[PDB]
Design a protein around this ligand. Structure first.
Ligand SMILES: Cc1cc2nc3c(=O)[nH]c(=O)nc-3n(C[C@H](O)[C@H](O)[C@H](O)COP(=O)(O)OP(=O)(O)OC[C@H]3O[C@@H](n4cnc5c(N)ncnc54)[C@H](O)[C@@H]3O)c2cc1C
Ligand SMILES: Cc1cc2nc3c(=O)[nH]c(=O)nc-3n(C[C@H](O)[C@H](O)[C@H](O)COP(=O)(O)OP(=O)(O)OC[C@H]3O[C@@H](n4cnc5c(N)ncnc54)[C@H](O)[C@@H]3O)c2cc1C
Ligand SMILES: CC(=O)N1CCC(C(N)=O)CC1
Ligand SMILES: [Br-]
Ligand SMILES: [Br-]
Ligand SMILES: [Br-]
Ligand SMILES: [Br-]
Lengths: 487, 489
């Protein structure tokens, strides 16, 4: 048995920020628990968290790899010549390079623990034994052997989320993004199930690395993918994915999956349609990872959707027990989890309470081409404000008229409170959009108005200067109804 | 044949002149004439309708840098598993130039159609000069004795003729070219010397390096010790290293003394130091000077500054009440979006009853080197002269994807310079892929007087290079009454 100021269950984005800050900034004694020291099967996430091991970091490397399919083709318009029939995409090399980069990060976190006073790492499965006792066991089974018993003044729940799998016959013949990161071969025919960012991003990855004759299909149960993003951009990215050979099946949903004699999968949709693929990747959602924590031993309250309930300062209903990150089922983003962990420790162990601001958070989708966004979409703004203006610019950049990818329209939209010009949201689609949007997030913390953008001098030639060239609204929402002119 | 009369006559149909002319005609209903020497790009006069940026400037050079970037993309793709016949790769310069020419000509034609269509906005072809306070003469050539094509009466006259490459007076200067000719070379040079340490020399060095034929070599020379004066010093040193790492030879503290032709027709350059270099093309990019000579400004008494630009006040007014000047002719910041801003402000002031002056501080700009620069605001040595305590926040590292691509020399640099007394951000300086795109919204931030805490409180977008700007809370070092030091005393 060992005594600690803070015990953190989950060595992830938020948990590591909280633990490191508690130990090095405030001199506290910190223990952090995770189930695996490095990435991959059997538990996939590990020391460093989901983003490091099976999330943002490896997927961004794989999207970068997939972008070379476009670069090799597009180089021709600028005079580059080579033998196109010799091009091939080696998925094994990609996965090996990705594996080496993730493992390097795993090892560096190991050394961080070894090198930092008052910051200890424990391997195993943590759960709540009592209000001030965290127990670490060998497996997720609550009857497996006890490895440690950790007394704690404060307990932080930071176990993240896990892929949601629908209750359909044959769901056991499907995979999630966890397994996609380790496929021995690139699938020739693949169905990605879901309309959200993970399904869209992997669709682009598989599309570039598929062997000859391959086909990527994405299905989504409603009418338009990427719910929660700007509607113009949802339509345009649909169009540009299709232009690059991905088939988008909307208003369709798998009803069952069965095994074929050759090892492929036979998917039957609710509509009666069928599709044979080598791999079915379910990406319909991610759910808080609460079941192994034994929250019933202490009475930590969950919300109806399954997150741990928290106030604005990440406090549960049980004194001295806190939760941050994906387990609170709010914004599932790594920098938000980091921010929450830092605010929590500043509040508990420092002299100043701090709460995370969950509005105006910039984020991205690494689709091909990608999305960058910050703030409100226009239909959410129209329910909160009487007069909303939308400024819109959409065109194919000159370079893609030369590259031959004329379908690659760049979209830039600014949403304002028209009563005073305040910028409520900015939404971008096109090369560079995730990089352009970061400083827009800073603008929204300075109560920037549309005139502040238009009066700034542009950098030329860029896509970003479009944001400083919009003077006149394209249309409006008045009392919630869309219209081209004001009344 | 009768002279024609206008509210405003613009000499030069470029970045600033077209903005002023279009806004005067379409926003305020004024009658406008605009004069330029050529209706589409290229020899003999190079610039034309649309200006220097459209014809032999930002627009074509960015397309050519984009073309040059594919040399890096093709090599870097292997680390991510891409395989193809490397021996078959060829860079076809003629196809690049043909594609660029067709793009620029399309812009030329669209501007031509704007004038043919738009009420109160007329274009006149020829050389404009000042005859008197209210008369612009349009002649067939730059020679003031050449034939008169038109006389344009004007209540207000806007000088917007831009700038021109400067050529040093050395023996053999006739064997050298400028950036104007570089845009039209029939074949890519095997060996080329670019002379100058500024952005045009650096950018063209990158272009020639990608399209050079087998066994070629690009050399850049600069007369002082470190290229890219005026930019952040950490970035100046890193750009030098990363150009060198991509095979460009950088000769600093060197300057051509003379050029002669070898018997085979190549250029033999002798430097002041006595070093020699044999190249196929010498491109001079040592500076650009305002185009005032042909305007006959003596006829009306428009004052020039010692340096040679048209003298203007904050509202672009010359010493002659109804004559104005904007853009490169004022010999200040030579950027297309500054000329456009000045032209819009002038027209709002003169015809719009809403006075406004251009802010020449905190202007974001870029260098499309490979990899590129994005910057806005003060460099730290300048800030240290104006502020008692200056803080510098700095992040520099090779991004993970270039540890896989093999281009490990590609360190991304992000620096924020502050007034440490109150946290105000004085400048932001970036080197690396995406830097020109990242810096645009930084310019909006600085115009809103952002402090370092506004950057740090903003939640990052992950994974990006840009999020480094929102993760810096502790200064790397300081300047205290001008003195650099790791810690405050
Ligand atoms: C494919 C994919 C791509 C993504 N891309 C992005 C992106 O580009 N940008 C972005 O911002 N976000 C992205 N995310 C989301 C991001 O990964 C999460 O928001 C973030 O990792 C959550 O941080 P956290 O601290 O809540 O938990 P995590 O980082 O998930 O860490 C939780 C840790 O808890 C451990 N654990 C779980 N249960 C126990 C237990 N009982 N005992 C001990 N340890 C336990 C796990 O092994 C894991 O390491 C992506 C997610 C996925 C799945
Ligand atoms: C190689 C190069 C690259 C550049 N890259 C960039 C970049 O990336 N970004 C950026 O912001 N800036 C860039 N610039 C600078 C930009 O081109 C200028 O700042 C901008 O064009 C200046 O606009 P202006 O209105 O002053 O003049 P210009 O745009 O030069 O227009 C002046 C016009 O006047 C005409 N003219 C001249 N004399 C007469 C006369 N007597 N009668 C009639 N017409 C006349 C000319 O033909 C010309 O069309 C670059 C410049 C060069 C040379
Ligand atoms: C995945 C998704 O629906 N997103 C859109 C809304 C974003 C936000 N800041 O609320 C987060 C990303
Ligand atoms: Br779905
Ligand atoms: Br929908
Ligand atoms: Br060629
Ligand atoms: Br701060």
């Amino acid at each position: 048995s060992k005594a600690f100021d803070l015990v953190v269950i989950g060595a992830g984005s938020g948990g590591l920020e909280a633990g490191w800050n508690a130990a090095t900034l405030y001199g506290k004694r910190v223990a952090v628990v995770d189930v695996q020291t490095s990435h991959g099967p059997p538990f996939y996430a590990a020391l460093g968290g989901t983003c490091v091991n099976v999330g943002c970091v490896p997927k961004k490397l794989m999207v970068t790899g997939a972008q070379y399919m476009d670069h090799l083709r597009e180089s021709a318009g600028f005079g580059w010549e080579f033998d196109g029939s010799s091009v091939k995409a080696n998925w094994k090399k990609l996965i090996a390079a990705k594996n080496e980069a993730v493992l390097d990060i795993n090892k560096s976190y190991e050394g961080m623990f070894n090198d930092t006073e008052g910051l200890d790492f424990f391997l195993g499965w943590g759960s709540l034994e009592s209000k001030n006792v965290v127990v670490v066991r060998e497996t997720a089974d609550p009857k497996s052997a006890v490895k440690e018993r950790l007394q704690a003044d404060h307990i932080l729940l930071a176990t993240g989320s896990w892929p949601q799998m629908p209750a359909i016959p044959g769901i056991e013949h499907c995979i999630s993004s966890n397994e996609a990161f380790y496929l021995p071969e690139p699938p020739r025919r693949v169905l990605t199930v879901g309309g959200g960012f993970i399904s869209v991003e992997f669709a682009g990855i598989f599309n570039a690395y598929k062997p000859p004759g391959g086909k990527v299909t994405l299905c989504y149960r409603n009418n338009l993918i990427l719910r929660g993003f700007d509607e113009t951009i949802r339509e345009e990215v649909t169009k540009q994915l299709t232009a690059n050979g991905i088939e988008i099946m909307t208003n369709e949903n798998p009803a069952k999956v069965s095994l074929n004699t050759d090892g492929s999968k036979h998917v039957t949709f609710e509509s009666g349609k069928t599709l044979d693929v080598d791999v079915v990747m379910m990406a319909i959602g991610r759910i808080p990872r609460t079941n192994d924590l034994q929250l019933g031993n202490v009475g930590v309250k969950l919300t109806p959707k399954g997150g741990v309930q928290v106030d604005e300062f990440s406090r549960t209903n049980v004194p001295n027990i806190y939760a941050i990150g994906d387990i609170t089922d709010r914004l599932m983003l790594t920098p938000v989890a980091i921010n929450e962990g830092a605010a929590l420790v500043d509040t508990v162990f420092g002299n100043k309470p701090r709460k995370t601001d969950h509005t105006r958070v910039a984020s991205a989708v690494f689709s091909i081409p990608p999305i960058g966004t910050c703030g409100l979409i226009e239909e959410v703004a129209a329910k909160e404000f009487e007069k909303v203006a939308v400024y819109m610019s959409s065109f194919t950049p000159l370079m893609h008229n030369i590259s031959g990818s004329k379908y690659k329209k760049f979209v830039a939209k600014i949403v304002t409170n028209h009563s005073d010009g305040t910028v409520l949201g900015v939404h971008l689609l096109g090369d560079g959009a995730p990089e352009i949007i970061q400083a827009v997030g800073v603008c929204l913390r300075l109560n920037a108005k549309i005139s502040d953008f238009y009066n700034t001098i542009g950098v030329h030639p860029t896509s970003a200067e479009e944001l400083c060239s919009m003077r006149t609204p394209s249309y409006y929402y008045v009392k919630g109804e869309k219209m081209e002119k004001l009344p």
